[PDB]
């Protein structure tokens, strides 16, 4: 929900990690149009712990959505964006019609049309060469055999549906830093339960225990390595691990 | 492939849930559509994105789409809530599927004109047109679902805005051919060779998206509808 989003020939690939990821606030910004999840399932994200999430935004035709995806190719997906076939990422896509199409038209996203030969996947060039195209050279001025190689959409409010900005953003998956919204539970009284305290799996009866834990420390062990101690990690307090009945 | 119960119940004055379940191909990772058709009459869109719902459904019916099952929750049914609800998904074979129906029984401007009907000739040839005009057209997609007396919806086929991806069903896959003349605004879907087991409408429905099922998995839904041509295909 930025304020305006970049071309489709450029990527601004924002890396998000370092934090946990909840997916879940997506869905109450705005209502998407295509939330297709190339290689993953869309409920199926707040288990799996990945190292680096990365996030691109770009503007392009509605026509031409379905051409973003693995192994497909197009007019904008051999020389701007290009999906391989080791990418397992959702593609969500939304239109913006309300915010990016003004009466006297927009000239401010750009897209290559033809490039020298076909760009590899998982790379971005902003490289802003005129075109050669003749059997006469260009001098990098704008001539009659000479063409730039970047043209503009021209996103008018006129203009029906299919030709409207439609705003996709590509959300990748890299194999830790970025997790899932780990949900927690009540603690119950002293009774012979399961417990799970971040990772720490075992039975046992939870009482309330008198020692004095160092503020660097969560559990202990005995003198036989059996875990029989441990803090709960939401409020400070010891809890004794005593063996079932 | 969707099990839905035949039939459920309910008074005037408490909230009933409709389930509908789905593999986790059409439900757990595309959305659900729901669909009232009163007994007589031409189905319409109640719920889409399993969150929105259009300006002439009112906000008394409620739905949630969670993991790989649907729920249409009606608050308050009416006297009038008396129909058959189904259900709407799009498997990885890239094909609409429907639930079962659901014949809730109470205990207490754009116009989509389709024609073409009579003798069907069941191995000869047959022509159904479909007119649209007033809703732009080249724009809004169209839909193809008919529906045998008695039984519930059978899709058939469905065409993106621009004229381009189109998906056929088992049953009829490679034979029929679905185009569109955006110069005349109008549908057509020339069906050859149909045997004598496909008694059914053919209702046209008008798409509210613009591409294929299979990009646009959170738009597709079929608003307006039309009076579909009851077939005599016999012996």
């Known amino acids: 929900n930025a304020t305006t989003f970049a071309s489709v020939y450029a990527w601004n690939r924002k890396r998000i990690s370092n934090c946990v990821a909840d997916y879940s606030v997506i869905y109450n910004f705005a209502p998407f149009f295509a939330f297709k999840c190339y290689g993953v399932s869309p409920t199926k994200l707040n288990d799996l712990c990945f190292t680096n999430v990365y996030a691109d935004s770009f503007v392009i035709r509605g026509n031409e959505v379905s051409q973003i995806a693995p192994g497909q190719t197009g007019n904008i997906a051999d020389y701007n964006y290009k999906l391989p076939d080791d990418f397992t990422g959702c593609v969500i896509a939304w239109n913006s019609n309300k915010l990016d199409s003004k009466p006297s038209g927009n000239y401010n996203y750009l897209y290559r049309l033809f490039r020298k030969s076909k760009l590899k996947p998982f790379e971005r060039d902003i490289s802003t060469e005129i075109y050669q195209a003749g059997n006469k050279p260009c001098n990098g001025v704008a001539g009659s055999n000479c063409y730039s190689p970047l043209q503009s959409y021209g996103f008018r409010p006129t203009y029906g549906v299919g030709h409207q900005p439609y705003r996709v953003v590509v959300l990748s998956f890299e194999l830790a830093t970025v997790c899932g919204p780990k949900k927690s539970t009540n603690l119950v009284k002293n009774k012979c339960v399961n417990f799970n305290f971040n990772g720490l799996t075992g039975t046992g009866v939870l009482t309330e225990s008198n020692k004095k834990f160092l503020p660097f420390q969560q559990f202990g062990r005995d003198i036989a390595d059996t875990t029989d101690a441990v803090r709960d990690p939401q409020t400070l307090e010891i809890l004794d691990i005593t063996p079932c009945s | 492939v969707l099990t839905q119960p035949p039939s459920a119940s309910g008074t005037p004055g408490q909230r009933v849930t409709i389930s509908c379940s789905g593999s986790?191909?059409?439900?757990?990772?595309?959305?659900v559509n729901w669909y009232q058709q009163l007994p007589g009459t031409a189905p319409k869109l109640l719920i889409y994105?399993?969150?929105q719902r259009p300006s002439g459904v009112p906000d008394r019916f409620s739905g949630s789409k969670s993991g790989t099952s649907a729920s249409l929750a009606i608050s308050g049914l009416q006297s009038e809530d008396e129909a058959d609800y189904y259900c709407?998904?799009?498997?990885?074979?890239?094909?609409?599927?429907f639930g079962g129906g659901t014949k809730l029984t109470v205990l207490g401007e754009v116009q989509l004109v389709e024609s073409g009907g009579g003798v069907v000739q069941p191995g000869g040839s047959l022509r159904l047109s479909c007119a649209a005009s007033?809703?732009?057209?080249?724009?809004?997609?169209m839909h193809w679902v008919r529906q045998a007396p008695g039984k519930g919806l059978e899709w058939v086929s469905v065409?993106?805005?621009?004229?381009?991806?189109?998906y056929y069903a088992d049953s009829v896959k490679g034979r029929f051919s679905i185009s569109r003349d955006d110069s005349k605004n109008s549908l057509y879907l020339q069906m050859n060779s149909l045997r004598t087991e496909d008694t059914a409408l053919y209702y046209c429905?008008?798409?509210?998206?613009?591409?294929?099922?299979?990009?646009?998995?959170?738009?597709?839904?079929?608003?307006?509808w039309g009076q579909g041509t009851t077939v005599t295909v016999s012996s």
């Open positions: 065409i993106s805005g621009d004229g381009g991806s189109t």
């Open positions: 986790s191909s059409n439900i757990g990772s595309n959305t």
């Open positions: 007033g809703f732009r057209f080249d724009d809004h997609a």
């Open positions: 709407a998904a799009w498997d990885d074979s890239l094909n609409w599927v």
């Open positions: 994105s399993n969150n």
């Open positions: 429905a008008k798409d509210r998206s613009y591409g294929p099922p299979d990009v646009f998995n959170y738009e597709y839904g079929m608003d307006v």
